[PDB]
């Protein structure tokens, strides 16, 4: 029962956006199930994009019908969403979801029972940029990483390959005057462990395929 959104985190204006969703544990052409795409602009609400049945048929939202195209690959168990001729207003988080239906005169679109986790796609004429990661030394003890000058979001930050959870607090990125982002992540740790345990952050930036690990040290 899993849905995994996939695709680039950036597209330029007047360019076709392409996203994909890998479905797991259920067949993408199984009867009684429909699959669809939904989008959410930063700080805004949900907008349905379109839905595809268990057969070939697709239905779309008349507000984006001209540009939107959806396809299901029955052998790969995955969806495809195309959005041609993008603009600034297409910047959004795209979601993959499974849609139930009600069988009457027409199979009626219904409740979305399972949702994936979306992909933030930014529309911009700028190109991607990986972050310049710098360590923030500790001083009971607060230490962290500074992920500087990158584009566009998201950035994921793990500590000790996910082993360190307790005390982790990552902050919201700031959009700098330059057009690039800056993001910090810190961990509150026992000061007694500063010289005994290794503390390394794991900065991922999917738009530029960048992964930066950085050991943070005192002094």
């Amino acid at each position: 029962l899993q849905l995994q959104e996939s695709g680039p985190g950036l597209v330029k204006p007047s360019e076709t956006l392409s996203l994909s969703c890998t479905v797991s544990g259920v067949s993408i052409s199984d009867n009684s199930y429909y699959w669809g795409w939904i989008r959410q602009p930063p700080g805004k609400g949900l907008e349905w994009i379109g839905t595809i049945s268990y057969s070939g048929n697709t239905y779309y939202n008349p507000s984006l019908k001209s540009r939107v195209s959806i396809s299901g690959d029955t052998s790969k168990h995955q969806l495809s969403l195309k959005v041609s001729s993008v603009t600034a207003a297409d910047t959004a988080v795209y979601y993959c979801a499974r849609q139930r239906i009600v069988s009457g005169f027409v199979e009626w679109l219904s409740k979305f029972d399972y949702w994936g986790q979306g992909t933030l796609v930014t529309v911009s004429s700028a190109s991607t940029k990986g972050p310049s990661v710098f360590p923030l030394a500790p001083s009971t003890a607060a230490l962290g990483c500074l992920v500087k000058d990158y584009f566009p979001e998201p950035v994921t930050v793990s500590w000790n390959s996910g082993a360190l959870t307790s005390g982790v607090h990552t902050f919201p990125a700031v959009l700098q005057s330059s057009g690039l982002y800056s993001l910090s992540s810190v961990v509150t740790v026992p000061s007694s462990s500063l010289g005994t345990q290794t503390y390394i952050c794991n900065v991922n930036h999917k738009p530029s395929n960048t992964k930066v690990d950085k050991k943070v040290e005192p002094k």
Partner: protein, 148 residues
């Protein structure tokens, strides 16, 4: 008067066929209710018949229904099928049927009404309302006063 001779028909133009809706017959017309009166079937040839005037419709439907493969289960509209003239609210519906065959036939024996054309079946993508028709004699003078 109850006599066979009561009534005069001077031209054929004075025969008027009026379409009255089922909504005007206090029948539930919500899409989910309305669709319970529609059904698919084979072996029946769709028939159409011309009429002259009709009631302003409360609700209408603009429907497309296919089979899973995307092929319409509804017939393509003939040249003479136009959207119903006056609908207050149109219900646009587009979808597919998992296991249905044939054409859409009204259960009550009522007609699918379009613009001056009544039918035993539902045409793909055309605005219609459900109803029945009635025949009567109206001379031009009577006709002119009503419609004006």
């Amino acid at each position: 008067v109850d006599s066979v001779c009561s009534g005069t028909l001077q031209k054929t133009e004075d025969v008027h066929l009026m379409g009255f809706t089922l909504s005007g017959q206090k029948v539930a017309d919500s899409p989910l209710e309305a669709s319970k009166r529609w059904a698919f079937r084979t072996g029946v040839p769709p028939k159409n018949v011309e009429y002259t005037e009709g009631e302003e419709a409360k609700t209408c439907y603009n429907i497309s229904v296919t089979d899973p493969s995307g092929k319409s289960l509804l017939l393509d509209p003939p040249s003479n099928i136009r959207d119903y003239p006056k609908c207050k609210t149109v219900h646009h519906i587009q979808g597919q049927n998992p296991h249905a065959q044939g054409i859409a036939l009204h259960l009550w024996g009522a007609f699918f009404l379009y613009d001056r054309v009544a039918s035993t079946t539902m045409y793909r993508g055309k605005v219609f309302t459900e109803g029945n028709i009635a025949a009567m004699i109206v001379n031009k003078t009577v006709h002119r006063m009503i419609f004006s």
